[PDB]
Structures are given as C-alpha cells and as structure tokens.
Amino acid sequence: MFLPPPECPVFEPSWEEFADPFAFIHKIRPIAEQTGICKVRPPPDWQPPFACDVDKLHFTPRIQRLNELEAQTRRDYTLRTFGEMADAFKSDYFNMPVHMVPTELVEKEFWRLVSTIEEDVTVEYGADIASKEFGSGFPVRDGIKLSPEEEEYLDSGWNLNNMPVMEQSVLAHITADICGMKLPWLYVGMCFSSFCWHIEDHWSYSINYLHWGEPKTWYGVPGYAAEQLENVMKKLAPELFVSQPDLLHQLVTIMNPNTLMTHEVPVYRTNQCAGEFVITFPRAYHSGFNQGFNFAEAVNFCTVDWLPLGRQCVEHYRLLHRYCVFSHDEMICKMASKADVLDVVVASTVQKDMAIMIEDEKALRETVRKLGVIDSERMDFELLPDDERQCVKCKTTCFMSAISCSCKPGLLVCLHHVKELCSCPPYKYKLRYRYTLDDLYPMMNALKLRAES
Ligand SMILES: CC(C)c1c(-c2cnn(C3CCN(C(=O)CCl)CC3)c2)[nH]c2c(C#N)cnn2c1=O
Numbered sequence: 001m002f003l004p005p006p007e008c009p010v011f012e013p014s015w016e017e018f019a020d021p022f023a024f025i026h027k028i029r030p031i032a033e034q035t036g037i038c039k040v041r042p043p044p045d046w047q048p049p050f051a052c053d054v055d056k057l058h059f060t061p062r063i064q065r066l067n068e069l070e071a072q073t074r075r076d077y078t079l080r081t082f083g084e085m086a087d088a089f090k091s092d093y094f095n096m097p098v099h100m101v102p103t104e105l106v107e108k109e110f111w112r113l114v115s116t117i118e119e120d121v122t123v124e125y126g127a128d129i130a131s132k133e134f135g136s137g138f139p140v141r142d143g144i145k146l147s148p149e150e151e152e153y154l155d156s157g158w159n160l161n162n163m164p165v166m167e168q169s170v171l172a173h174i175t176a177d178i179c180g181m182k183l184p185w186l187y188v189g190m191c192f193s194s195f196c197w198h199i200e201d202h203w204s205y206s207i208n209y210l211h212w213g214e215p216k217t218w219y220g221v222p223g224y225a226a227e228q229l230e231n232v233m234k235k236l237a238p239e240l241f242v243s244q245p246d247l248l249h250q251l252v253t254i255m256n257p258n259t260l261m262t263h264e265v266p267v268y269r270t271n272q273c274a275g276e277f278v279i280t281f282p283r284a285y286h287s288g289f290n291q292g293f294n295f296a297e298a299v300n301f302c303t304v305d306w307l308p309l310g311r312q313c314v315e316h317y318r319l320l321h322r323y324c325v326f327s328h329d330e331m332i333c334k335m336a337s338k339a340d341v342l343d344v345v346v347a348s349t350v351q352k353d354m355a356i357m358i359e360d361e362k363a364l365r366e367t368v369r370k371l372g373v374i375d376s377e378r379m380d381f382e383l384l385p386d387d388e389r390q391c392v393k394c395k396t397t398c399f400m401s402a403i404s405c406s407c408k409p410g411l412l413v414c415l416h417h418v419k420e421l422c423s424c425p426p427y428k429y430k431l432r433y434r435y436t437l438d439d440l441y442p443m444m445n446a447l448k449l450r451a452e453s
Pocket residue numbers: 073074125126127180187188189193194195208216290296298
C-alpha cells in the first residue's frame with residue numbers, strides 16, 4: 001500500500017508577475033520554502049518552440065537497477081531509438097497503450113517494484129550537460145538563422161540558458177569555469193527511470209523545465225527538515241554515510257516517502273507535465289521518477305536570499321570533510337572587486353556577508369598567531385588549481401588564508417587545522433594570505449557606496 005503525500009503548491013502567475021523570474025521567486029518564497037518544491041505554470045501563450053531532429057541527436061545511456069535503499073553513484077542511442085525502446089518497454093510492462101496507463105497506477109507500481117527483491121527491473125536514461133550533440137531545448141544564438149518565434153524567446157528570463165547570467169543572480173560574475181553550476185543539464189527519461197534523494201551543491205536553488213513527453217513525478221522536503229531526513233536515512237541505510245574520496249564518488253538512494261512520513265518528516269508530491277516548471281529551494285531534499293518517455297532541462301541558481309545559506313553550507317562541508325565545488329569567499333571578493341557594476345540590492349547583500357567574513361577572518365588570524373605562527377606572505381590563491389589548495393584535514397578550498405610549511409612542500413591546512421599539517425614546530429610555518437585586513441575594508445566600502453546610491 002502507498003499513501004500519496006499531499007500536493008505541493010502550484011502557482012499560475014499573470015504575465016506581469018511572470019515577466020521577472022527573480023522577483024516572482026522572491027514573492028512566492030514564504031509559501032514555497034515551507035514545502036521545499038513548488039510548481040509554476042507559465043501564462044498560456046508563453047510557449048517556447050521545440051526544434052530537434054530525432055535521428056541526429058545522440059547520447060550514451062546510463063543504466064539503473066531499481067532497488068529501495070540500495071546505493072547508487074552520483075552503447076549509444078539516438079533520440080528516436082531511445083524513444084522506441086522506452087515506449088515498447090512501458091506498453092509491454094502494462095500490456096496497455098501508453099496514454100491509458102493512469103499516473104496513479106505508475107506511482108503505485110513504482111513503489112511496489114523497488115521494494116520487492118524478487119523483481120530485477122533495470123531501466124536506462126540520459127543525463128548530461130549540453131554539447132554539440134545534444135544541445136539545449138531552448139533557443140540559443142549561433143551563426144542557423146532563427147525564426148522570429150525562436151528570437152522572441154532568446155532573451156527570456158525563463159530560458160534556462162539566461163537565468164544564471166542575469167543581474168539578480170550572484171553566480172553571474174563568477175569566472176572560475178565550474179561547468180556543473182552555470183550550465184543546464186538535459187534529462188531524457190523513460191518509465192520508472194528515477195532520481196535519488198539529494199540536495200544541490202552548495203545548497204543552491206534549482207529550476208527544472210519539462211519540454212515535452214509524459215509527466216515527471218516529484219517528492220520534496222522543506223529546507224528546515226533536512227537534518228531530520230538525514231537522521232532517518234542514517235538509521236535505515238548506514239552504508240550511504242561512509243565518507244568517499246571524491247566529489248564524483250557520492251552515494252544516493254531510493255526511499256519510499258511514506259517511510260519519511262512515518263518518522264514525522266514532511267513530504268510533498270507533484271506531477272510535472274509538459275510546459276511546466278518545478279523549483280526547488282535551498283537545502284530542500286527531492287527525488288522522483290519519470291512516467292514515460294520525456295525530455296527535461298534544469299539549472300542551478302543562487303539569489304541574494306541564498307548568500308548566507310551558502311556561507312553556512314561551506315561551514316557544514318568543513319565539519320563533514322566534504323569537497324567544495326568553488327570557494328564562497330572567492331566569489332564574494334570577486335563581486336566586491338566589481339562593485340561599480342553590481343545591482344544595488346546585490347551590492348547591499350554582499351556587503352553584509354563580507355562583514356561577517358572579515359570578522360571571522362580577523363579572529364582566525366589572531367588564534368593562529370597565538371599558536372606561534374609568525375612568518376607570513378601574500379599568496380594569489382585564485383591562480384592555483386583547486387586540488388592544489390584544499391585543506392589536508394577538512395578538504396575545504398582555501399582562499400582567504402592557509403598555513404604552509406617547508407617541511408611538507410605544497411601542502412596546506414585552513415586556519416581551523418593548524419595542528420594537522422606536519423610534525424615541525426609552528427615557528428617553521430607560514431601564514432599565506434590573499435588580502436591584509438587593510439585591503440579588505442576599502443573593498444567593503446565600495447559595496448556600501450554602490451548600495452547607498
Ligand atoms: C532519471 C534522470 C533522467 C534524471 C536525473 C538524474 C539521474 N542521474 N543523474 C545524475 C547525473 C550525474 N550527477 C552529477 O553530475 C551531479 Cl550534478 C548526479 C546525478 C541525474 N535527475 C533529475 C532531476 C533532479 N534533480 C529531475 N529530473 N531528473 C531526471 O529525470
């Protein structure tokens with residue numbers, strides 16, 4: 001037996017409300033952050049055109065066994081041959097035509113199937129960022145001639161290629177090519193292909209658009225219940241919490257939302273249909289599965305609302321010895337160095353995060369001086385490859401400062417882990433720092449001038 005969770009909120013913005021995605025997300029935030037996910041139906045005439053040759057789009061499939069609580073890690077088809085496989089799979093599974101399989105029946109059967117070890121069902125799917133094959137489902141510029149209808153959507157705020165580089169996004173002016181977090185992912189689904197329970201890197205927002213095909217079923221949990229959900233999963237499946245040696249080595253799993261609900265974790269559901277958006281909020285866990293053959297596109301993003309949570313996230317990563325995708329402090333200082341061109345509300349919010357950064361850094365430097373670290377030298381941390389500037393102990397990506405020792409050339413610890421670097425006494429250590437305190441205060445003042453205008 002499966003008892004469906006309550007439905008998440010659904011928003012139907014007017015064209016006036018829809019025009020600015022960041023203003024809209026800020027508006028609905030008081031409601032949607034209580035449920036973790038929400039659905040957005042665009043105005044009825046906002047319809048971006050979909051244009052693809054099913055025979056020239058190629059991708060390498062991933063394969064998936066469907067067993068609840070089993071760990072999963074974080075050939076070649078055209079879109080036509082995948083679709084033919086996917087449709088045959090589903091109509092053979094149910095001995096029905098595909099449009100007559102009720103979505104409630106697919107959902108019921110999915111949770112039966114994953115809990116029965118007597119069933120050995122495996123499925124395939126596509127998941128990758130855009131390239132030369134495959135390509136965004138939204139219109140992009142390229143010197144093809146576009147139709148006027150495609151040109152209408154080139155600069156839309158809801159074209160997921162544009163959303164990151166808009167001015168109310170803070171991941172905008174970052175220049176460390178991250179790939180994973182400014183570029184959309186493309187998802188080609190089939191019946192029962194599923195995404196395991198997760199949150200996004202650095203606790204970012206995400207936005208997902210279903211271009212066409214059968215629906216995508218979602219489960220979501222509010223940010224406030226994140227640690228509650230994790231404690232439930234630790235009890236029931238401890239193997240997933242053994243620390244792994246790379247950010248490409250993470251373990252995730254399928255888990256029945258009724259189990260979370262039995263342990264008093266709030267869970268919401270929705271069926272996302274073609275032409276609709278789903279938005280996930282910072283630190284909101286989510287999972288789901290595809291009802292049939294379909295095609296979706298998604299991207300991470302970060303608003304000014306998110307900035308303090310981003311700082312909290314990197315602290316939580318340090319406690320867990322988890323790798324970072326980028327340095328939060330580096331992004332803050334980059335924006336400070338471009339204060340004259342920042343949105344004024346962005347400038348105001350970055351200024352507040354920077355004040356916390358500077359006070360924390362002042363206290364950390366005082367502590368390490370009292371440990372007997374005396375020598376110091378400026379260092380341009382942003383020039384080092386990331387794997388050359390991670391703390392030996394907690395794996396954090398250094399930027400404001402680190403400790404080195406000539407006893408162990410090339411190794412660094414952050415200022416929380418001075419005792420973990422090597423056996424030599426601390427007078428042989430060196431504080432390497434990006435900025436003096438006196439460099440930092442004028443940087444924060446530029447932001448205030450920009451904000452106060
Ligand atoms: C079943 C497929 C098509 C699918 C997937 C999916 C399956 N595996 N992966 C991997 C790829 C590699 N990877 C990283 O690189 C980390 Cl960034 C980890 C995740 C993504 N995710 C999602 C979401 C979400 N959220 C919404 N719909 N959706 C899907 O339909």
